[PDB]
């Protein structure tokens, strides 16, 4: 089997992407944030604290004939940005772009932090990291991808994120028309539960390529590109007036700038992020100071190839016995 779903930016900055997901019988369609950096599928629901819901579409398990309470199971998760959610667990039928899993753990939020409440366009998350990170207790649950794998034509999913435009998540097949040139595959470590790999270096604008190993994760659930302070300083030094601002929380630059591109290595291949992708607009409405899309990972504890990097590529998440990552230009 296969699945194919369109994923859409939630706003004009591509702060995140939502993909329609059918849950239960009859289908309840919720727009979820597909997150290759976590492994819980959780949703706003009929059980969510009423004051913490503001515009989201909710899953109501009592209206689904295939929903079953997973007796005794709870979940609680915290993300790298400090947001969080928690609740109990149902199993139900979950379909993505024509691909159906029965008995999927659907984690029902009783509590969500303010940033989720304030995000009216995101009805939940669908984790696509490795199932070892799943927070369900006392019995850990599998991701949608892990549940689907055996039925898939090929044990893969692909992320094809758009820049200010819709894109595509495919399950079980590689759309050879969706990218240019070849796909370069690179090794993955699952030791921390992430799609963790090692980039072979970088370049800034038309600069020469610096060969250097950069360990990081492919994370569709993170907006920006977080890299070592040395790399990030080298990038922003090429933008007149750019500076790191503690008060804002990162590198800012004059909105009048033209940003250079940023290239990262995948083995011998190169992915080029256009400078435009790195502009996240005014720090506050009306400001002439703009927020940078490449930021320091120092104090995160890990480098993150978030959407800024991934949307510049066609990305293959290969979940074979030995997982790997593939990157192609597009």
From Swiss-Prot:
Give the GO molecular function terms.
aspartic-type endopeptidase activity
Give the keywords, sorted: Aspartyl protease, Disulfide bond, Hydrolase, Protease, Signal, Zymogen
Q: List, for all copies, the residue spans of the domain called Peptidase A1.
A: 17-328
Q: What class of enzyme is it?
A: hydrolase
> Where does the chain cross the membrane?
none
Q: Which reactions are catalysed by this chain?
A: Hydrolysis of proteins with specificity similar to that of pepsin A, prefers hydrophobic residues at P1 and P1', but does not cleave 14-Ala-|-Leu-15 in the B chain of insulin or Z-Glu-Tyr. Clots milk
Q: Name one GO biological process term.
A: proteolysis
**Residues at the active site:** 35, 199
EC id:
3.4.23.22
| SS bonds (residue pairs) | 255-290
**Family statement:** Belongs to the peptidase A1 family.
Q: What is this protein's name?
A: Endothiapepsin
The organism is Cryphonectria parasitica (Chestnut blight fungus)
Taxonomic placement: Eukaryota, Fungi, Dikarya, Ascomycota, Pezizomycotina
Identify the coding gene. EAPA
